Amino acid sequence: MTEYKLVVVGAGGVGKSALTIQLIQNHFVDEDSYRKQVVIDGETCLLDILDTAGYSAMRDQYMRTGEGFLCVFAINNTKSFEDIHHYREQIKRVKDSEDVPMVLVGNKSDLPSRTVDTKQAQDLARSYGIPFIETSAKTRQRVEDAFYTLVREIRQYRLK
Ligand SMILES: NCCN[C@H]1CC[C@@H](Nc2ncc3cc2C(=O)N([C@H]2CC[C@@H](N)CC2)CCCCCN2C(NS3(=O)=O)[S+]3C4=C(Cl)CC=C(O)C423)CC1
Ligand SMILES: Nc1nc2c(ncn2[C@@H]2O[C@H](COP(=O)(O)OP(=O)(O)NP(=O)(O)O)[C@@H](O)[C@H]2O)c(=O)[nH]1
Ligand SMILES: [Co+2]
Ligand SMILES: [Mg+2]
Incomplete structure:
Protein backbone atom coordinates (compact mmCIF):
# COMPACT_ATOMS: atom_id res chain seq x y z
CA MET A 1 0.00 0.00 0.00
CA THR A 2 1.45 3.36 -1.10
CA GLU A 3 2.66 5.62 1.78
CA TYR A 4 3.02 9.45 1.39
CA LYS A 5 5.24 11.44 3.78
CA LEU A 6 3.44 14.84 4.20
CA VAL A 7 5.06 17.77 6.07
CA VAL A 8 3.09 20.70 7.51
CA VAL A 9 5.34 23.85 7.71
CA GLY A 10 4.75 27.54 8.49
CA ALA A 11 5.31 30.28 11.02
CA GLY A 12 4.50 30.02 14.71
CA GLY A 13 0.76 30.01 15.50
CA VAL A 14 -0.60 29.68 11.92
CA GLY A 15 -2.49 26.48 12.90
CA LYS A 16 -0.19 23.66 11.61
CA SER A 17 -1.07 21.47 14.67
CA ALA A 18 -4.80 22.46 14.53
CA LEU A 19 -5.00 21.48 10.78
CA THR A 20 -3.26 18.12 11.34
CA ILE A 21 -5.58 17.25 14.31
CA GLN A 22 -8.71 18.21 12.24
CA LEU A 23 -7.67 15.71 9.55
CA ILE A 24 -6.83 13.03 12.22
CA GLN A 25 -9.60 13.46 14.88
CA ASN A 26 -12.18 15.57 12.93
CA HIS A 27 -12.02 17.76 16.08
CA PHE A 28 -10.82 21.38 16.70
CA VAL A 29 -8.00 21.25 19.25
CA ASP A 30 -8.39 23.97 21.92
CA GLU A 31 2.36 14.31 19.34
CA ASP A 32 4.58 15.23 16.32
CA SER A 33 3.43 12.70 13.59
CA TYR A 34 0.11 11.00 12.63
CA ARG A 35 -0.99 8.15 10.32
CA LYS A 36 -4.27 7.90 8.38
CA GLN A 37 -5.38 5.56 5.55
CA VAL A 38 -7.62 7.19 2.86
CA VAL A 39 -8.93 6.41 -0.70
CA ILE A 40 -8.41 9.16 -3.39
CA ASP A 41 -9.40 8.61 -7.07
CA GLY A 42 -9.88 4.87 -6.37
CA GLU A 43 -6.43 4.47 -4.79
CA THR A 44 -5.76 3.55 -1.12
CA CYS A 45 -2.75 5.12 0.65
CA LEU A 46 -1.39 5.73 4.09
CA LEU A 47 -0.69 9.34 4.92
CA ASP A 48 2.34 9.81 7.28
CA ILE A 49 2.06 13.47 8.44
CA LEU A 50 4.78 15.43 10.28
CA ASP A 51 3.70 18.53 12.35
CA THR A 52 6.79 20.83 12.43
CA ALA A 53 7.83 23.90 14.45
CA GLY A 54 7.60 27.42 12.96
CA TYR A 55 17.60 22.65 14.26
CA SER A 56 19.06 23.13 10.69
CA ALA A 57 20.08 19.39 10.40
CA MET A 58 16.69 17.93 11.56
CA ARG A 59 14.93 20.57 9.40
CA ASP A 60 17.01 19.41 6.42
CA GLN A 61 16.12 15.73 7.17
CA TYR A 62 12.33 16.23 7.11
CA MET A 63 12.61 18.44 4.02
CA ARG A 64 14.52 15.53 2.34
CA THR A 65 12.11 12.77 3.48
CA GLY A 66 8.97 14.80 2.89
CA GLU A 67 7.28 14.07 -0.40
CA GLY A 68 4.75 16.95 -0.25
CA PHE A 69 4.60 20.13 1.88
CA LEU A 70 1.56 22.06 3.17
CA CYS A 71 3.01 25.58 3.38
CA VAL A 72 0.68 27.23 5.88
CA PHE A 73 0.16 30.94 6.63
CA ALA A 74 -2.64 32.55 8.66
CA ILE A 75 -4.82 35.15 6.83
CA ASN A 76 -4.55 37.49 9.88
CA ASN A 77 -0.73 37.39 9.93
CA THR A 78 1.13 39.08 7.03
CA LYS A 79 4.57 38.05 8.38
CA SER A 80 3.48 34.41 8.20
CA PHE A 81 2.47 34.99 4.54
CA GLU A 82 5.76 36.75 3.71
CA ASP A 83 7.60 33.84 5.46
CA ILE A 84 6.21 31.33 2.87
CA HIS A 85 9.17 32.56 0.70
CA HIS A 86 11.58 31.22 3.39
CA TYR A 87 9.92 27.80 3.82
CA ARG A 88 9.73 27.33 -0.01
CA GLU A 89 13.41 28.40 -0.43
CA GLN A 90 14.56 26.02 2.34
CA ILE A 91 12.63 23.07 0.81
CA LYS A 92 13.88 23.76 -2.74
CA SER A 113 -9.04 40.27 11.48
CA ARG A 114 -7.83 39.47 7.90
CA THR A 115 -4.64 41.16 6.64
CA VAL A 116 -3.87 38.91 3.58
CA ASP A 117 -6.20 39.14 0.54
CA THR A 118 -7.26 35.89 -1.19
CA LYS A 119 -6.20 37.49 -4.55
CA GLN A 120 -2.66 38.27 -3.18
CA ALA A 121 -2.20 34.65 -2.07
CA GLN A 122 -3.76 33.28 -5.35
CA ASP A 123 -1.23 35.36 -7.41
CA LEU A 124 1.75 34.23 -5.29
CA ALA A 125 0.66 30.56 -5.60
CA ARG A 126 0.36 31.10 -9.41
CA SER A 127 3.98 32.51 -9.41
CA TYR A 128 5.11 29.35 -7.52
CA GLY A 129 3.07 27.02 -9.82
CA ILE A 130 1.24 25.44 -6.80
CA PRO A 131 -2.39 25.18 -5.70
CA PHE A 132 -3.79 27.64 -3.12
CA ILE A 133 -6.57 26.68 -0.65
CA GLU A 134 -8.04 28.76 2.17
CA THR A 135 -8.89 26.63 5.20
CA SER A 136 -10.35 26.92 8.70
CA ALA A 137 -9.12 24.36 11.29
CA LYS A 138 -11.83 25.85 13.59
CA THR A 139 -14.76 24.93 11.25
CA ARG A 140 -12.95 22.17 9.21
CA GLN A 141 -13.60 24.10 5.93
CA ARG A 142 -11.38 22.76 3.03
CA VAL A 143 -9.05 20.89 5.50
CA GLU A 144 -9.48 17.54 3.68
CA ASP A 145 -9.27 19.44 0.32
CA ALA A 146 -5.84 20.86 1.38
CA PHE A 147 -4.30 17.47 2.35
CA TYR A 148 -5.95 15.53 -0.59
CA THR A 149 -4.88 18.19 -3.13
CA LEU A 150 -1.30 17.77 -1.76
CA VAL A 151 -1.52 13.96 -2.27
CA ARG A 152 -2.80 14.61 -5.87
CA GLU A 153 0.19 16.97 -6.47
CA ILE A 154 2.60 14.16 -5.27
CA ARG A 155 0.88 11.67 -7.64
CA GLN A 156 1.07 14.19 -10.57
CA TYR A 157 4.81 14.70 -9.82
CA ARG A 158 5.32 10.86 -9.78
CA LEU A 159 4.10 10.81 -13.51
CA LYS A 160 6.84 13.34 -14.65
N1 LIG B 1 5.31 20.50 16.46
C1 LIG B 1 6.24 20.12 17.50
C2 LIG B 1 7.64 20.07 16.92
N2 LIG B 1 7.90 18.76 16.32
C3 LIG B 1 9.06 18.80 15.47
C4 LIG B 1 8.95 17.75 14.44
C5 LIG B 1 10.04 17.88 13.47
C6 LIG B 1 11.35 17.71 14.15
N3 LIG B 1 11.53 16.31 14.61
C7 LIG B 1 11.87 15.35 13.76
N4 LIG B 1 12.08 15.67 12.49
C8 LIG B 1 12.42 14.69 11.57
C9 LIG B 1 12.67 13.37 11.96
C10 LIG B 1 12.45 13.08 13.27
C11 LIG B 1 12.08 14.03 14.21
C12 LIG B 1 11.87 13.63 15.55
O1 LIG B 1 12.80 13.31 16.26
N5 LIG B 1 10.66 13.58 16.07
C13 LIG B 1 10.47 13.19 17.48
C14 LIG B 1 9.22 12.43 17.65
C15 LIG B 1 9.11 11.97 19.08
C16 LIG B 1 8.96 13.13 19.99
N6 LIG B 1 7.68 13.75 19.75
C17 LIG B 1 10.11 14.07 19.83
C18 LIG B 1 10.42 14.43 18.37
C19 LIG B 1 9.51 13.96 15.25
C20 LIG B 1 8.69 12.84 14.62
C21 LIG B 1 9.36 12.10 13.44
C22 LIG B 1 8.40 11.22 12.72
C23 LIG B 1 9.09 10.34 11.60
N7 LIG B 1 9.42 11.21 10.38
C24 LIG B 1 10.66 11.69 10.16
N8 LIG B 1 11.80 11.46 10.90
S1 LIG B 1 13.05 12.14 10.89
O2 LIG B 1 13.26 12.54 9.49
O3 LIG B 1 14.10 11.29 11.41
S2 LIG B 1 10.52 12.61 8.75
C25 LIG B 1 9.01 12.40 8.52
C26 LIG B 1 8.26 12.92 7.49
CL1 LIG B 1 9.05 13.93 6.27
C27 LIG B 1 6.92 12.63 7.40
C28 LIG B 1 6.31 11.86 8.35
C29 LIG B 1 7.15 11.35 9.37
O4 LIG B 1 6.56 10.58 10.28
C30 LIG B 1 8.47 11.60 9.47
C31 LIG B 1 11.49 18.78 15.28
C32 LIG B 1 10.35 18.73 16.21
N1 LIG C 1 -9.69 31.21 14.80
C1 LIG C 1 -8.86 30.21 14.51
N2 LIG C 1 -7.86 29.94 15.34
C2 LIG C 1 -7.13 28.89 14.92
C3 LIG C 1 -7.21 28.22 13.72
N3 LIG C 1 -6.23 27.25 13.64
C4 LIG C 1 -5.55 27.39 14.75
N4 LIG C 1 -6.03 28.40 15.57
C5 LIG C 1 -5.49 28.85 16.84
O1 LIG C 1 -4.21 29.42 16.63
C6 LIG C 1 -3.36 29.16 17.77
C7 LIG C 1 -2.17 28.36 17.32
O2 LIG C 1 -2.68 27.16 16.69
P1 LIG C 1 -1.69 25.93 16.53
O3 LIG C 1 -2.41 24.84 15.81
O4 LIG C 1 -1.02 25.70 17.83
O5 LIG C 1 -0.61 26.57 15.57
P2 LIG C 1 0.83 26.01 15.20
O6 LIG C 1 1.18 26.54 13.85
O7 LIG C 1 0.73 24.50 15.29
N5 LIG C 1 1.84 26.62 16.31
P3 LIG C 1 3.39 26.25 16.62
O8 LIG C 1 4.24 26.67 15.44
O9 LIG C 1 3.79 27.05 17.84
O10 LIG C 1 3.52 24.76 16.82
C8 LIG C 1 -4.24 28.43 18.77
O11 LIG C 1 -4.84 29.39 19.63
C9 LIG C 1 -5.27 27.75 17.86
O12 LIG C 1 -6.47 27.44 18.51
C10 LIG C 1 -8.26 28.53 12.81
O13 LIG C 1 -8.50 28.08 11.67
N6 LIG C 1 -9.02 29.60 13.28
CO1 LIG D 1 15.30 34.37 0.16
MG1 LIG E 1 1.99 23.26 16.56
Whole structure:
Protein backbone atom coordinates (compact mmCIF):
# COMPACT_ATOMS: atom_id res chain seq x y z
CA MET A 1 0.00 0.00 0.00
CA THR A 2 1.45 3.36 -1.10
CA GLU A 3 2.66 5.62 1.78
CA TYR A 4 3.02 9.45 1.39
CA LYS A 5 5.24 11.44 3.78
CA LEU A 6 3.44 14.84 4.20
CA VAL A 7 5.06 17.77 6.07
CA VAL A 8 3.09 20.70 7.51
CA VAL A 9 5.34 23.85 7.71
CA GLY A 10 4.75 27.54 8.49
CA ALA A 11 5.31 30.28 11.02
CA GLY A 12 4.50 30.02 14.71
CA GLY A 13 0.76 30.01 15.50
CA VAL A 14 -0.60 29.68 11.92
CA GLY A 15 -2.49 26.48 12.90
CA LYS A 16 -0.19 23.66 11.61
CA SER A 17 -1.07 21.47 14.67
CA ALA A 18 -4.80 22.46 14.53
CA LEU A 19 -5.00 21.48 10.78
CA THR A 20 -3.26 18.12 11.34
CA ILE A 21 -5.58 17.25 14.31
CA GLN A 22 -8.71 18.21 12.24
CA LEU A 23 -7.67 15.71 9.55
CA ILE A 24 -6.83 13.03 12.22
CA GLN A 25 -9.60 13.46 14.88
CA ASN A 26 -12.18 15.57 12.93
CA HIS A 27 -12.02 17.76 16.08
CA PHE A 28 -10.82 21.38 16.70
CA VAL A 29 -8.00 21.25 19.25
CA ASP A 30 -8.39 23.97 21.92
CA GLU A 31 2.36 14.31 19.34
CA ASP A 32 4.58 15.23 16.32
CA SER A 33 3.43 12.70 13.59
CA TYR A 34 0.11 11.00 12.63
CA ARG A 35 -0.99 8.15 10.32
CA LYS A 36 -4.27 7.90 8.38
CA GLN A 37 -5.38 5.56 5.55
CA VAL A 38 -7.62 7.19 2.86
CA VAL A 39 -8.93 6.41 -0.70
CA ILE A 40 -8.41 9.16 -3.39
CA ASP A 41 -9.40 8.61 -7.07
CA GLY A 42 -9.88 4.87 -6.37
CA GLU A 43 -6.43 4.47 -4.79
CA THR A 44 -5.76 3.55 -1.12
CA CYS A 45 -2.75 5.12 0.65
CA LEU A 46 -1.39 5.73 4.09
CA LEU A 47 -0.69 9.34 4.92
CA ASP A 48 2.34 9.81 7.28
CA ILE A 49 2.06 13.47 8.44
CA LEU A 50 4.78 15.43 10.28
CA ASP A 51 3.70 18.53 12.35
CA THR A 52 6.79 20.83 12.43
CA ALA A 53 7.83 23.90 14.45
CA GLY A 54 7.60 27.42 12.96
CA TYR A 55 17.60 22.65 14.26
CA SER A 56 19.06 23.13 10.69
CA ALA A 57 20.08 19.39 10.40
CA MET A 58 16.69 17.93 11.56
CA ARG A 59 14.93 20.57 9.40
CA ASP A 60 17.01 19.41 6.42
CA GLN A 61 16.12 15.73 7.17
CA TYR A 62 12.33 16.23 7.11
CA MET A 63 12.61 18.44 4.02
CA ARG A 64 14.52 15.53 2.34
CA THR A 65 12.11 12.77 3.48
CA GLY A 66 8.97 14.80 2.89
CA GLU A 67 7.28 14.07 -0.40
CA GLY A 68 4.75 16.95 -0.25
CA PHE A 69 4.60 20.13 1.88
CA LEU A 70 1.56 22.06 3.17
CA CYS A 71 3.01 25.58 3.38
CA VAL A 72 0.68 27.23 5.88
CA PHE A 73 0.16 30.94 6.63
CA ALA A 74 -2.64 32.55 8.66
CA ILE A 75 -4.82 35.15 6.83
CA ASN A 76 -4.55 37.49 9.88
CA ASN A 77 -0.73 37.39 9.93
CA THR A 78 1.13 39.08 7.03
CA LYS A 79 4.57 38.05 8.38
CA SER A 80 3.48 34.41 8.20
CA PHE A 81 2.47 34.99 4.54
CA GLU A 82 5.76 36.75 3.71
CA ASP A 83 7.60 33.84 5.46
CA ILE A 84 6.21 31.33 2.87
CA HIS A 85 9.17 32.56 0.70
CA HIS A 86 11.58 31.22 3.39
CA TYR A 87 9.92 27.80 3.82
CA ARG A 88 9.73 27.33 -0.01
CA GLU A 89 13.41 28.40 -0.43
CA GLN A 90 14.56 26.02 2.34
CA ILE A 91 12.63 23.07 0.81
CA LYS A 92 13.88 23.76 -2.74
CA ARG A 93 17.51 24.05 -1.42
CA VAL A 94 17.31 20.61 0.36
CA LYS A 95 15.42 18.87 -2.49
CA ASP A 96 17.65 20.36 -5.24
CA SER A 97 14.53 20.98 -7.33
CA GLU A 98 12.25 23.84 -8.38
CA ASP A 99 9.62 21.10 -8.76
CA VAL A 100 8.55 19.93 -5.24
CA PRO A 101 4.90 19.00 -4.47
CA MET A 102 3.45 21.83 -2.34
CA VAL A 103 0.10 23.45 -1.58
CA LEU A 104 -0.17 27.00 -0.21
CA VAL A 105 -2.74 27.07 2.66
CA GLY A 106 -4.24 30.30 4.09
CA ASN A 107 -5.62 29.10 7.46
CA LYS A 108 -7.98 30.93 9.98
CA SER A 109 -10.38 31.80 7.13
CA ASP A 110 -13.13 32.12 9.82
CA LEU A 111 -11.40 35.24 11.29
CA PRO A 112 -12.50 38.84 10.47
CA SER A 113 -9.04 40.27 11.48
CA ARG A 114 -7.83 39.47 7.90
CA THR A 115 -4.64 41.16 6.64
CA VAL A 116 -3.87 38.91 3.58
CA ASP A 117 -6.20 39.14 0.54
CA THR A 118 -7.26 35.89 -1.19
CA LYS A 119 -6.20 37.49 -4.55
CA GLN A 120 -2.66 38.27 -3.18
CA ALA A 121 -2.20 34.65 -2.07
CA GLN A 122 -3.76 33.28 -5.35
CA ASP A 123 -1.23 35.36 -7.41
CA LEU A 124 1.75 34.23 -5.29
CA ALA A 125 0.66 30.56 -5.60
CA ARG A 126 0.36 31.10 -9.41
CA SER A 127 3.98 32.51 -9.41
CA TYR A 128 5.11 29.35 -7.52
CA GLY A 129 3.07 27.02 -9.82
CA ILE A 130 1.24 25.44 -6.80
CA PRO A 131 -2.39 25.18 -5.70
CA PHE A 132 -3.79 27.64 -3.12
CA ILE A 133 -6.57 26.68 -0.65
CA GLU A 134 -8.04 28.76 2.17
CA THR A 135 -8.89 26.63 5.20
CA SER A 136 -10.35 26.92 8.70
CA ALA A 137 -9.12 24.36 11.29
CA LYS A 138 -11.83 25.85 13.59
CA THR A 139 -14.76 24.93 11.25
CA ARG A 140 -12.95 22.17 9.21
CA GLN A 141 -13.60 24.10 5.93
CA ARG A 142 -11.38 22.76 3.03
CA VAL A 143 -9.05 20.89 5.50
CA GLU A 144 -9.48 17.54 3.68
CA ASP A 145 -9.27 19.44 0.32
CA ALA A 146 -5.84 20.86 1.38
CA PHE A 147 -4.30 17.47 2.35
CA TYR A 148 -5.95 15.53 -0.59
CA THR A 149 -4.88 18.19 -3.13
CA LEU A 150 -1.30 17.77 -1.76
CA VAL A 151 -1.52 13.96 -2.27
CA ARG A 152 -2.80 14.61 -5.87
CA GLU A 153 0.19 16.97 -6.47
CA ILE A 154 2.60 14.16 -5.27
CA ARG A 155 0.88 11.67 -7.64
CA GLN A 156 1.07 14.19 -10.57
CA TYR A 157 4.81 14.70 -9.82
CA ARG A 158 5.32 10.86 -9.78
CA LEU A 159 4.10 10.81 -13.51
CA LYS A 160 6.84 13.34 -14.65
N1 LIG B 1 5.31 20.50 16.46
C1 LIG B 1 6.24 20.12 17.50
C2 LIG B 1 7.64 20.07 16.92
N2 LIG B 1 7.90 18.76 16.32
C3 LIG B 1 9.06 18.80 15.47
C4 LIG B 1 8.95 17.75 14.44
C5 LIG B 1 10.04 17.88 13.47
C6 LIG B 1 11.35 17.71 14.15
N3 LIG B 1 11.53 16.31 14.61
C7 LIG B 1 11.87 15.35 13.76
N4 LIG B 1 12.08 15.67 12.49
C8 LIG B 1 12.42 14.69 11.57
C9 LIG B 1 12.67 13.37 11.96
C10 LIG B 1 12.45 13.08 13.27
C11 LIG B 1 12.08 14.03 14.21
C12 LIG B 1 11.87 13.63 15.55
O1 LIG B 1 12.80 13.31 16.26
N5 LIG B 1 10.66 13.58 16.07
C13 LIG B 1 10.47 13.19 17.48
C14 LIG B 1 9.22 12.43 17.65
C15 LIG B 1 9.11 11.97 19.08
C16 LIG B 1 8.96 13.13 19.99
N6 LIG B 1 7.68 13.75 19.75
C17 LIG B 1 10.11 14.07 19.83
C18 LIG B 1 10.42 14.43 18.37
C19 LIG B 1 9.51 13.96 15.25
C20 LIG B 1 8.69 12.84 14.62
C21 LIG B 1 9.36 12.10 13.44
C22 LIG B 1 8.40 11.22 12.72
C23 LIG B 1 9.09 10.34 11.60
N7 LIG B 1 9.42 11.21 10.38
C24 LIG B 1 10.66 11.69 10.16
N8 LIG B 1 11.80 11.46 10.90
S1 LIG B 1 13.05 12.14 10.89
O2 LIG B 1 13.26 12.54 9.49
O3 LIG B 1 14.10 11.29 11.41
S2 LIG B 1 10.52 12.61 8.75
C25 LIG B 1 9.01 12.40 8.52
C26 LIG B 1 8.26 12.92 7.49
CL1 LIG B 1 9.05 13.93 6.27
C27 LIG B 1 6.92 12.63 7.40
C28 LIG B 1 6.31 11.86 8.35
C29 LIG B 1 7.15 11.35 9.37
O4 LIG B 1 6.56 10.58 10.28
C30 LIG B 1 8.47 11.60 9.47
C31 LIG B 1 11.49 18.78 15.28
C32 LIG B 1 10.35 18.73 16.21
N1 LIG C 1 -9.69 31.21 14.80
C1 LIG C 1 -8.86 30.21 14.51
N2 LIG C 1 -7.86 29.94 15.34
C2 LIG C 1 -7.13 28.89 14.92
C3 LIG C 1 -7.21 28.22 13.72
N3 LIG C 1 -6.23 27.25 13.64
C4 LIG C 1 -5.55 27.39 14.75
N4 LIG C 1 -6.03 28.40 15.57
C5 LIG C 1 -5.49 28.85 16.84
O1 LIG C 1 -4.21 29.42 16.63
C6 LIG C 1 -3.36 29.16 17.77
C7 LIG C 1 -2.17 28.36 17.32
O2 LIG C 1 -2.68 27.16 16.69
P1 LIG C 1 -1.69 25.93 16.53
O3 LIG C 1 -2.41 24.84 15.81
O4 LIG C 1 -1.02 25.70 17.83
O5 LIG C 1 -0.61 26.57 15.57
P2 LIG C 1 0.83 26.01 15.20
O6 LIG C 1 1.18 26.54 13.85
O7 LIG C 1 0.73 24.50 15.29
N5 LIG C 1 1.84 26.62 16.31
P3 LIG C 1 3.39 26.25 16.62
O8 LIG C 1 4.24 26.67 15.44
O9 LIG C 1 3.79 27.05 17.84
O10 LIG C 1 3.52 24.76 16.82
C8 LIG C 1 -4.24 28.43 18.77
O11 LIG C 1 -4.84 29.39 19.63
C9 LIG C 1 -5.27 27.75 17.86
O12 LIG C 1 -6.47 27.44 18.51
C10 LIG C 1 -8.26 28.53 12.81
O13 LIG C 1 -8.50 28.08 11.67
N6 LIG C 1 -9.02 29.60 13.28
CO1 LIG D 1 15.30 34.37 0.16
MG1 LIG E 1 1.99 23.26 16.56
